[PDB]
Amino acid sequence: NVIAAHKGVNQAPVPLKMERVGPHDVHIEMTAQITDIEIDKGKIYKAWTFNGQAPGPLVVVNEGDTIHFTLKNMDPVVPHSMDFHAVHASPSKDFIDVMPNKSGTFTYPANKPGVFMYHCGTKPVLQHIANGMHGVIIVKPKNGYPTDKEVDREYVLIQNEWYKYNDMNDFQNGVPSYVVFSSKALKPGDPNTNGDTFTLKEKPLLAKVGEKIRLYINNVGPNEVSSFHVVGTVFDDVYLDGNPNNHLQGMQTVMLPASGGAVVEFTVTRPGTYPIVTHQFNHAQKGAVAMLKVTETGE
Amino acid sequence: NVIAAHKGVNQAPVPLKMERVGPHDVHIEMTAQITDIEIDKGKIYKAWTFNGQAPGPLVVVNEGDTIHFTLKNMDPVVPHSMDFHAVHASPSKDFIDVMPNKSGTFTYPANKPGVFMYHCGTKPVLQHIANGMHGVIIVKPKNGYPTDKEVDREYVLIQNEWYKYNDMNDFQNGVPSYVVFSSKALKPGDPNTNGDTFTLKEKPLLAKVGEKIRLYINNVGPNEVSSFHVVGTVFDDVYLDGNPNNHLQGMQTVMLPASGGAVVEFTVTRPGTYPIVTHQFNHAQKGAVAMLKVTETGE
């Protein structure tokens, strides 16, 4: 069930465009496009994406920024839209469909800090999210987190599921075929990957012995909850949804609803390879294990 | 698998009866009865209910009230019972079966504030809850919530699932056929509906631009968790189980276990239609989307 007009389509990834236009105003431009992604070795999914990545590119703004967002729809036949969980907006005015080969621009404020999902909001929403149109926007708190001075390194990890291609019965009633992690870059040099079963096993995240690591995490679903755990450590501090006031300490595992986020911080005390899992182990067996390699130097 | 003695039975809804008999004592009388409910267009489920609604009628009492509860069982063949999560009681003395065409009266205190499930407790409990015998009791806190002065409007929403009719294999091992929201009235004029796939899309909840809305929510299950989210906003304040001490701020999505409740508050800043979902999107696709319509006047 590949739509006839998508057969043979594979649009190259387009970089996110982003520029600050005032102390509290930021322009962001993203595309909706159809891009082949290898989600498991030998298995291509012709994903519906923002900017040719699934999950989509990371967006980072500051608390109190107003976002002036443009979506250019490169899909030749299906309309697409954008819903940022970070913003206050009218869904029926500001998260509306952009037609094929057209652009739309919408403006809305991000006044809460945290780790928010974004996704396409075109009906049926389950079809658009399951085919790949999901991502994270981080809204950095104006006053930071209480533990910022202790953090040595930070990474972003996103969990998603993949089902049988564009199969609405399976999206509604089936078990996931794969559950996967991806990482998105906060700064130049950091890994930026798609949701697949293998890249973060073959090319682990790096750290050095003794460091306190912060992960910004979100489970975009579409359908499952997550039981997020790093093997070999305990979370020193957890901020639910990345809001600094929702503080928990000393958690072994952090549940996340579908679309839920967190900031989690932990210390790695010995060199070695540390798996990162969802502890719902049927999903870990179906791809959701990433690796952190901790060395004496960090390289 | 409709029990022979229920074929042709459809008992009209009976109003909840409730009266205060002392500063801290309240009488409540409810029925158990068998009532046809249209859960999706064209699809009748011959539900097992309290008072002919599923979920059942809303009960609201004050912290510290003792409830003197009578159940009249109008089912001609199956016994029924009541378990309120709000109360301290002996299950084997106070949540016992009432036989067909009989009444029972039980007395127990509600000393904790919150948003509690109630349900039938007759074995097998899964069969009695899945066939419709669930509901919410709200216990209002003696000293309110810290944010009461900011709240402009409030509604109650309940999430439940429906399965294949009276099919114990499906109740145990199947995926839900429908997942639905209903609303129950806090005051005259407010919507009071059953768990179906369409009423709160066709007849949305109303609000005005700029208002802070409070929802009292509970996921009665029977089997699924919920990832509750309002599109276009972020929750300013969340009180888990409706206890004022379990305060979280700035959540995008609130997980609820089966039977879990919350009070959530959020601001609507622009006119439009705002979907209310569980963000486990397979369940939203199977009915669990309600609408909030925000106008310049509230009408």
Added chain:
Amino acid sequence: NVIAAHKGVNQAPVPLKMERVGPHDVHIEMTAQITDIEIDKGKIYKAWTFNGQAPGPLVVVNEGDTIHFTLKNMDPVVPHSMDFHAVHASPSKDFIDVMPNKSGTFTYPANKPGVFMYHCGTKPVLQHIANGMHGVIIVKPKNGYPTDKEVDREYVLIQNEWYKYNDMNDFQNGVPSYVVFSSKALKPGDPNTNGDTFTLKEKPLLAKVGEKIRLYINNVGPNEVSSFHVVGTVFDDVYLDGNPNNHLQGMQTVMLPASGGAVVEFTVTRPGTYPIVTHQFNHAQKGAVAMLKVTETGE
């Protein structure tokens, strides 16, 4: 699909060995062994276990203890390992496989209080956990919990699932066949049972009217979350993962991720039998109901 070398093997349970060797140092020795357990009446599962129990024996240490742990692998063909969620360790050095008929010793610190899962960490981990190699380690806080002076009795309860025997397709893609509770002894005389559908119904936990009960609970999974609830009461105080700082009050139901723990406290006000459930009622129907019997004397 019983491995040829396990046909006919049923190793008798071996007691946990544990001794303190310094103010902050404790030796623990456990076995990995293959033991038949009756998980439902008439149904034997040839479990992969620690010490012949599934879940495994309870381990209790103090915050700040270093554990010097030895695993003796009595399985004649499959390697096994131990991962304690309580500790900081290098997974690729300290949670490594011990071969058949060999021993390994590993040393690591437990510096966080709480109710932690332990399990085998040998690939595929889902197979080793689902076949029975799970358990709990409690790390008692140095300064106790704020509510310790109010607690009259305490018990440990663990929830797990069972699937079709050693069937990796079912472990990954199937619904559980059984979901069960077990209790592990904190002191001599307390019940110590395996995860089965019947023992804690036939031989309930005991308490006396008026007591405040503390349960240390963990949901080891492997795959499901839990909605933990005691019928007839409300939790006065909840400490997520058993860390004293993660305090919630007045909860009807406590969600637990897979591997998540809690300390929950509640008061029983009337004599009777009080069911303990996961409120995801398909799992309660498949075994996950235990009983607490409350008498005027406690006997």
